[PDB]
Amino acid sequence: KYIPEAPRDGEAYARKDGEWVLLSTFL
Amino acid sequence: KYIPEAPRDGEAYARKDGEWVLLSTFL
Amino acid sequence: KYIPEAPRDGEAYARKDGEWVLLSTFL
Numbered sequence: 001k002y003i004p005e006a007p008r009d010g011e012a013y014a015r016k017d018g019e020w021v022l023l024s025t026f027l
Numbered sequence: 028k029y030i031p032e033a034p035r036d037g038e039a040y041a042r043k044d045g046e047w048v049l050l051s052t053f054l
Numbered sequence: 055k056y057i058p059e060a061p062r063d064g065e066a067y068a069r070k071d072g073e074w075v076l077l078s079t080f081l
């Protein structure tokens with residue numbers, strides 16, 4: 001598939017297992 | 028809606044508020 | 055110029071040079 005827009009919520013996101021997950025967590 | 032291709036410039040981006048932002052800007 | 059899904063392998067991904075790169079490359 002193609003990837004949809006990430007949340008519109010002030011936060012940056014990486015992509016993991018077909019979903020948007022916060023970057024802050026991994027960092 | 029869907030995300031577009033990110034810039035092509037040798038650096039890595041994440042997805043935020045409907046734009047591609049540098050990873051270094053968070054690290 | 056929609057971008058296809060990242061590999062399904064449990065890893066966080068950032069977009070770079072028209073490809074998916076592992077977040078941990080830079081961590």
